[PDB]
Amino acid sequence: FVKPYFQERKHLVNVLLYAMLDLPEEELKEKINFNVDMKALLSLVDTLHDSDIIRHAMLYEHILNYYIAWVPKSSYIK
Amino acid sequence: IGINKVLDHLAPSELIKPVKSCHNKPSVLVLDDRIVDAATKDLYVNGFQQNPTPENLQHMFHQGIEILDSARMINVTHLALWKPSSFKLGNPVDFALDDNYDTFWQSDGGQPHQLDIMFSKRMDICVMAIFFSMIADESYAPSLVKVYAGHSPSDARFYKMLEVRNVNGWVALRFLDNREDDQLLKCQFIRLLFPVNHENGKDTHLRGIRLYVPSAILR
Amino acid sequence: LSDITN
């Protein structure tokens, strides 16, 4: 429901990928002409880095185990 | 708890399966008589040696029978039902089991010839005796033999391979792969196949065949 | 001799 609004805004790709790679603010300020909140930046880096979210023996174990416990547009719900 | 423990004993799984890394190819047995070895001497009785004359073959045929019967053993070749793939109206399997080199049995029909050995009661075969004549019956010589096993015509399964190059004598085949503890075979259904003969033959004879199993007064 | 090959 939300993605078209993201494509409506232009600078979203650059800031998000720079947020993904955690670049320093100095490189942001060189070629970006609008102010970016450093507190918002540090907060999003913290959220991004939040992490709270033999071969014959596995065939007997895992293949059997996957069917020991089982419950019923692609998946896309990773 | 006795019920739970015995169930584990009948069907051990975690203890049994080591790696499950079987090669799954069929093992082939070498029957050649030009190499002298202790294992070959156990399976080949007549001894390693020009082609002998037929009377010499008859003489060694009797001496092979005598040696095989010399040891403590019980013959139950006549204690089972036999049904070959097809006859030729000249010689039934009786002359194959008559223990005579002169007479012999011949099939006539499809190329994968079948020889059926059905048993009435659970008999534990230990040594199977078969006689080949490469020089005497080169036209109808058995070149490849596959021996099956099972408890019924339904559950016939592959046991062993046998390739023929030059064997003019009795062949002894004791069974050890199936059961190392018993050193014998336990089945009620045995069938033999002869898919192809030497030098691209058509039919096959069988000079001899025998089955071996283990166990004051007034006249 | 029979057993004629193809």
B77: left (phi over 0), alpha (psi -120 to 50) or beta: alpha
- CA–CA gap between residue A13 and residue A25 (Å, rounded): 16
The answer as to whether B218 is a domain residue is no
The answer as to whether B96 is a domain residue is yes
Q: Provide the angle, in degrees to the nearest 10, between the axes of the packed helices A12-21 and A38-49.
A: 60
Q: Domain count of chain B?
A: 1
Q: Which residues, including other chains, have CB under 8 Å from residue B127's CB and lie 6 or more apart?
A: B68, B73, B172, B173, B174, B212
- CA–CA gap between residue B122 and residue B132 (Å, rounded): 28
Contact yes or no for B201 and C1 at CB 8 A: no
> Rg (Cα) of chain B, in Å, rounded?
20
The answer as to whether B7 is a domain residue is yes
Is B88 an interface residue toward C (CB < 8 Å)?
no
- Domain containing B76 equals 1-213
Is A60 an interface residue toward B (CB < 8 Å)?
yes
Is B108 an interface residue toward C (CB < 8 Å)?
no
Our answer on whether B and C touch (3+ beta-carbon pairs < 8 Å) is: yes
CA distances from B193 to A57, B48, B176, B190, B203 (A): 38, 26, 21, 10, 12
- CA–CA gap between residue A27 and residue B187 (Å, rounded): 83
Is B90 an interface residue toward C (CB < 8 Å)?
no
- Identity (one letter) of the amino acid at A27? E
- CA–CA gap between residue B39 and residue B168 (Å, rounded): 18
Which residue's structure tokens are 């156990």? B42
Is A56 an interface residue toward B (CB < 8 Å)?
yes
Interface test with C, best of B196, B202, B204 (most C CBs within 10 A): B202
Strand pairing category for B127-131 and B113-119: unpaired
Counting one residue from A and one from B, how many pairs have CB atoms under 8 Å apart? 6
Which residues does chain B have within 8 Å of residue A56's beta carbon, measured at their own beta carbons? 19-21
Give the residue on B whose Cα is nearest the Cα of A57.
Answer: B19
CA A61 to chain centroid, in Å, comes to: 32
The DSSP letter of residue A22 is T
- B174 DSSP β-pair partners: B127
Q: What is the CATH number of the domain that holds B165?
A: 2.60.120.260
CA distances from B9 to B3, B58, B178 (A): 10, 53, 20
In the structure encoding, which two tokens stand for residue B82, read together? 């036999």
The answer as to whether B206 is a domain residue is yes
State the chains in contact with B (3 or more Cβ–Cβ pairs under 8 Å).
Answer: A, C
Is B23 an interface residue toward A (CB < 8 Å)?
no
Degrees, nearest 5: CA angle B92-B151-B40 = 70
- CA–CA gap between residue B210 and residue B64 (Å, rounded): 12
The answer as to whether B159 is a domain residue is yes
The answer as to whether B164 is a domain residue is yes
Contact yes or no for B202 and C1 at CB 8 A: no
The answer as to whether B171 is a domain residue is yes
- Report phi then psi at B160, rounded to 5: -150, 160
The answer as to whether B219 is a domain residue is no
In the structure encoding, which two tokens stand for residue B26, read together? 């069929």
* Residue B113 near residue B194, CB atoms below 8 Å: yes
* Residue B142 near residue B102, CB atoms below 8 Å: no
- Identity (one letter) of the amino acid at B149? A
In the structure encoding, which two tokens stand for residue B104, read together? 């012999």
HEC secondary structure over chain B: CHHHHHHHHHCCCCCCCCCCCCCCCCCEEECCCCCCCHHHHHHECCCCCCCCCHHHHHHHHHHHHHHHHHCCCEECCCCEEEEECCCCCCCCCCCCCCCCCCCCEECCCCCCEEEEEEECCCCEECEEEEECCCCCCCCCCEEEEEEEEECCCCCCEEEEEEECCCCCCEEEEECCCCCCCCCCEECCEEEEEEEEECCCCCCCEECEEEEEECCCCCC
CA distances from B171 to A11, A36, B42, B49, B207 (A): 88, 93, 10, 15, 12
Which residue's structure tokens are 């547009």? A73
* Residue B129 near residue B211, CB atoms below 8 Å: yes
